[PDB]
Amino acid sequence: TCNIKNGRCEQFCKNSADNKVVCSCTEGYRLAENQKSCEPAVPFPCGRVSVSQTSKLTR
Amino acid sequence: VVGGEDAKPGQFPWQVVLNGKVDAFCGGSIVNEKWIVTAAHCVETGVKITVVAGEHNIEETEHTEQKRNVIRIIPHHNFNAAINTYNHDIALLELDEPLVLNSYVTPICIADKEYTNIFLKFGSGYVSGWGRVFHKGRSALVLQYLRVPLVDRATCLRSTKFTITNNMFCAGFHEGGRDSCQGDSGGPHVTEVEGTSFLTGIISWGEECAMKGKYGIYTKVSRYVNWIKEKTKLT
């Protein structure tokens, strides 16, 4: 059920038969392998920072 | 924005600034390559509007800017139905040429009505803009941002004599000192959900800025997400 922890869905959750859950994501993303996480499906999907900022790290 | 901090380049890639008869007079957010969402009180008809995406410091440049002309303006149909209420304070701007998306020009995510409300309910959102950095003072050069806590509706109602409709919400601190302000209108109130930002409100109005006992008032985006989606479809 989406009751607890949004059904473990990273973005959207909808309850399904027998207390099951179907996760979903916004435009520009696709449900990942785990069917829980949201994955970028376009080069520049909405709402994400991609400049990463700075440049002092492993990368 | 009063009491906030300098954004870093590309930190809020969905933020745009609007220029017209007055420079940098309001903010807005990128819905897609052809559409901007802002406040209806920033664009009441007439005058020519220019939008600048990928903006950071209004007086310098890193060459990330994209300037576009507004060919169509769509204020919510019920805005100004009731004189001086600021109810339904939201509007859409169509750009002449599409924006080219990149790290400095990226849309803000817009969930359905149910989830936008759930995200607002998380209780902490970010507001940003090039508006006044002091009540009655100068405007910002570098984009400013500030995290503001959601305020329970009952407290919201008691903070002012003006009417807070079901299309608005309050955000700010009980002690004041931190707030959006003049010039920040139209800019976004956003909620970050595990690294992804969703539009939860529009900077709309208030009484002065950052006053203890007062809060910034925002257009409740959840009540308008179907309208936004319907008017900004790409063909």
Swiss-Prot record, chain A:
<feature type="disulfide bond">
    <location>
        <begin position="25"/>
        <end position="38"/>
    </location>
</feature>
<protein>
    <recommendedName>
        <fullName>Coagulation factor IXa light chain</fullName>
    </recommendedName>
</protein>
<feature type="disulfide bond">
    <location>
        <begin position="2"/>
        <end position="13"/>
    </location>
</feature>
<feature type="domain" description="EGF-like 2">
    <location>
        <begin position="1"/>
        <end position="39"/>
    </location>
</feature>
<feature type="disulfide bond">
    <location>
        <begin position="9"/>
        <end position="23"/>
    </location>
</feature>
